[PDB]
């Protein structure tokens, strides 16, 4: 069985959270409105009609939750800073209460021996910036994000040594601006009637470009002003499905590779090579922004580590858009691929609660090797891995705690991860389970339970340990 000894000395184990999904206290201590407050309070946007006004109240309950982490022997905790608690209006007046709050959280974690891994941007853009210039659509976001980042380096970098600037820019660009399923909800209305405005063919690429420049601008500030004295490191958490060819044909083998370049490469190729993947330049053409030479020089090498958010593996086949019909540009169409968890009607694996989450442990090992090979062995952290139970009102809490499926999931994915390190020479430095606590799963609301701890929403957010808590405790025992 797995032990700490199955991993390199110093390997970091943690759990992960995000501010909007956990904190609650949305109108407390000067917090400004975000695009997700707006989204959650708009008809049609959240499948279970819920919101995160309270969520799991980690804003007030963080000391309890820190104890729940320590109970397993966790080394670290990934949490995000809500930009709107620091600058309620995105720019302008600093909110001292926001600083005081995250200082309390950081100090409390460190006092328990738990290292903070801090995400600066986990999707909760101040609504003021959405109103001011449509947020990520405007180049101004780059300097505004970088200034916010700098304030965080200044206030917290004496203690915080591990920073994730952005969580899943791919998810944001696609879900926020192509599908319009996540905030701010924008898409080609001809493609999805529920959207109020947007353009699925152009906006995702603009947003992605701005994310890339925003990271680079924050990284330049960090390296020039803070890194020498603070001695920390900066990365990004990329959402990454593994892709296998739907058939053993070179066309589908190439399609799987291309799907990867459009998902991870879209961001990582700029950070490692200074430009977008050639396949994107070829297929997206003039809708794909170009870096200037000075921009490429700040973007290339801007990561200290690669955060990988990984859950699942799909099959990919080559796809041609219908030659007949009016073309409505969108990101999937641009890839020249279709990726699905089915081959000949047979699923690639068992599925968790989430309709997208298929259980394919080997994908973890394949992906680690891919990253090592393509990017010349950068340090990698698994910044998210886990699975969800349903929220089932027809079973007892006691039965809800019996998460043997999650135990098997973590076991199998970690076994693959350990092999990628020991056998394959992949430089993986740590692993964070999604998630500490059941929480608000964005548009899925409270219908999805990802936690190691069960949260009783019908009994003042009481935390109960699922069986996986004991499993992690045993694993991490020293």
Q: Which of 168, 203, 244, 295 is catalytic?
A: 168
For residue 174, the tally of other CB atoms under 10 A from its CB is 26
> CA-CA distance, 6 to 29, in Å (whole number)?
44
Distances (CA, A) of 319 to 62, 337, 361: 48, 5, 26
Structure tokens of 133?
């210039």
CA dihedral 399, 405, 410, 412 (to 10 degrees): 160
For residues 166 and 212, what is the distance between their CA atoms, to the nearest angstrom? Answer: 9
Length of the chain in residues, anyone? 478
- Contact by Cβ (8 Å): 427, 372: yes
* Catalytic residue selected from 203, 244, 261, 384: 384
Q: SS3 letters for the chain? A: CCCHHHCCCCCEEEEECCHHHHCCCCCCCCCCCEHHHHHHCCCCCCCCCCCCCCCCCHHHHHHHHHHHHHCCCCCEEEEECCHHHHCCCCCCCCCHHHHHHHHHHHHHHHHCCCEEEEEEECCCCEHHHHHHHCHHHCCHHHHHHHHHHHHHHHHHCCCCCEEEEEECHHHHHHHHHCCCCCCCCCCCCCCCCCCCCCCCCCHHHHHHHHHHHHHHHHHHHHHHHHHHHHCCEEEEEEECCEEEECCCCHHHHHHHHHHHHHHHHHHHHHHHHCCCCHHHHHHHHHHCCCCCHHHHHHHCCCCCEEEEECCCEEEEEECCCCCCCCCCCCHHHHHCEEEECEECCEECCCECCCCCCECCCHHHHHHHHHHHHHHCCCCEEEEEECCCEECCCCCCHHHHCCCHHHHHHHHHHHHHHHHHHHCCCCCEEEEEEECCECCCCHHHHHHEECCCEEEECCCCCEEEECHHHHHHHHHHCC
State the Cα angle at 363 between 358 and 369, rounded to 5°: 165
Q: Secondary structure of 62-103 in the HEC alphabet?
A: HHHHHHHHHCCCCCEEEEECCHHHHCCCCCCCCCHHHHHHHH
Which of these, 275, 288, 272, lies nearest to 370 by C-alpha position? 272
Contacts 24+ apart (CB under 8 A), 92-98: 94/151, 95/29, 95/30, 95/31, 95/32, 97/29, 97/30, 98/29, 98/30, 98/31
Judge contact between 50 and 442, C-beta under 8 A: no
In this structure, the strands spanning 12-16 and 428-434 are parallel
Number of domains in the chain: 1
Closest C-alpha among 260, 299, 264, 266 to residue 280: 266
CB count in 10 Å sphere of residue 444: 18
Residue 321 Cα to chain centre, angstroms: 29
Cα torsion at 70, 307, 251, 321 (round to 10°)? 100
Question: Residue 438's closest CA among 426, 427, 449, 425?
Answer: 449
Please state whether beta strands 342-343 and 346-347 pair in parallel, antiparallel, or not at all (unpaired).
Answer: antiparallel
Q: Alpha-carbon distance 277 to 262, whole Å?
A: 8
| Residue 272 Cα distances to 165, 214, 296, 299, angstroms | 16, 16, 10, 8
Q: Measured in Å, how far apart are the chain's first and last C-alpha atoms?
A: 15
How was this structure determined? It was done by X-ray
Nearest to 84 by CA among 40, 157, 27: 27
Tokens 């891995």 correspond to 385
- Which of 85, 31, 270 shows the shortest CA–CA distance to 169? 270
Distances (CA, A) of 259 to 58, 239, 309, 339: 37, 13, 16, 8
8 A C-beta contact, residue 213 and residue 159? no
Are the CB atoms for 125 and 135 separated by under 8 Å?
A: yes
* Three state DSSP letters for 139-202: CHHHHHHHHHHHHHHHHHCCCCCEEEEEECHHHHHHHHHCCCCCCCCCCCCCCCCCCCCCCCCC
* Among candidate residues 434, 422, 332, the one with its CA nearest the CA of residue 16: 434
Domain around 143: 1-478
Which residue in 354, 326, 328 sits closest to 341, CA to CA?
A: 354
What is the CA 27 to chain-centroid distance, rounded?
25
Q: 317 is written with which tokens?
A: 């086949």
In angstroms, rounded to a whole number, what is the distance separating the alpha carbons of residues 344 and 121?
Answer: 39
23 part of the active site: no
261 is catalytic: no
CATH number of the domain within which 418 lies: 3.20.20.80
């Amino acid at each position: 069985g797995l032990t700490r000894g199955s991993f390199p000395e110093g390997f970091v184990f943690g759990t992960a959270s995000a501010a909007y999904q956990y904190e609650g206290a949305v109108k407390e201590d000067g917090r400004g409105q975000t695009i997700w407050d707006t989204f959650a309070h708009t008809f049609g946007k959240i499948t279970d009609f819920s919101n995160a006004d309270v969520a799991v109240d980690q804003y007030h309950r963080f000391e309890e939750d820190i104890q729940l982490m320590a109970d397993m022997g966790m080394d670290a905790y990934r949490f995000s800073i809500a930009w709107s608690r620091i600058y309620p209006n995105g720019v302008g007046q600093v909110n001292q209460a926001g600083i005081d709050h995250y200082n309390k959280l950081i100090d409390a974690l460190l006092a328990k021996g738990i290292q903070p891994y801090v995400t600066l941007y986990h999707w909760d853009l101040p609504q003021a910036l959405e109103d001011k210039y449509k947020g990520w659509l405007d180049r101004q976001i780059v300097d505004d994000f970088a200034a916010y980042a700098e304030t965080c380096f200044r206030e917290f970098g004496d203690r915080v040594k591990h920073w994730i600037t952005l969580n899943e820019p791919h998810t944001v660009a696609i879900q926020g601006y192509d599908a319009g399923l996540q905030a701010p909800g924008r898409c080609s209305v001809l493609l999805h009637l529920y959207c109020k405005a947007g353009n699925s063919g152009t906006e995702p690429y603009v947003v992605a470009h701005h994310f890339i420049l925003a990271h680079a601008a924050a990284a330049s500030i960090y390296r020039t002003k803070y890194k020498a004295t603070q001695n920390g490191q900066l990365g990004i958490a990329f959402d990454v499905m593994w892709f296998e060819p739907m058939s053993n044909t070179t066309i589908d083998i190439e399609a799987a590779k291309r799907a990867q370049e459009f998902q991870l490469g879209w961001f990582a190729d700029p950070f490692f090579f200074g430009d977008y993947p050639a396949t994107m330049r070829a297929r997206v053409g003039e809708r794909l922004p170009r870096f200037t030479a000075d921009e490429a020089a700040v973007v290339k090498g801007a990561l200290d580590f690669v955060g990988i958010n990984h859950y699942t593996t799909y099959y990919t086949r080559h796809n041609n858009t219908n030659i007949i019909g009016t073309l409505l540009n969108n990101t999937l169409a641009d890839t020249g691929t279709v990726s699905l968890p089915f081959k000949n009607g047979k699923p690639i694996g068992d599925r968790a609660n989430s309709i997208w989450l298929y259980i394919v442990p080997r994908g973890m090992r394949s992906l680690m090797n891919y990253v090592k090979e393509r990017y010349n062995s950068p340090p990698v952290y698994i910044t998210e891995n886990g699975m969800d139970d349903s929220n089932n009102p027809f079973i007892s809490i006691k039965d809800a705690l019996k998460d043997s499926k999650r135990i098997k999931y973590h076991n199998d994915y970690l076994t693959n991860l350990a092999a990628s390190i020991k056998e394959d020479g992949c430089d993986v430095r740590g692993y964070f389970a999604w998630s500490l606590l059941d929480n608000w799963e964005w548009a899925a609301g409270y219908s999805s339970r990802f936690g190691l701890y069960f949260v009783d929403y019908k009994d003042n957010l009481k935390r109960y340990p699922k069986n996986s808590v004991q499993w992690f405790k045993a694993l991490l025992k020293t």
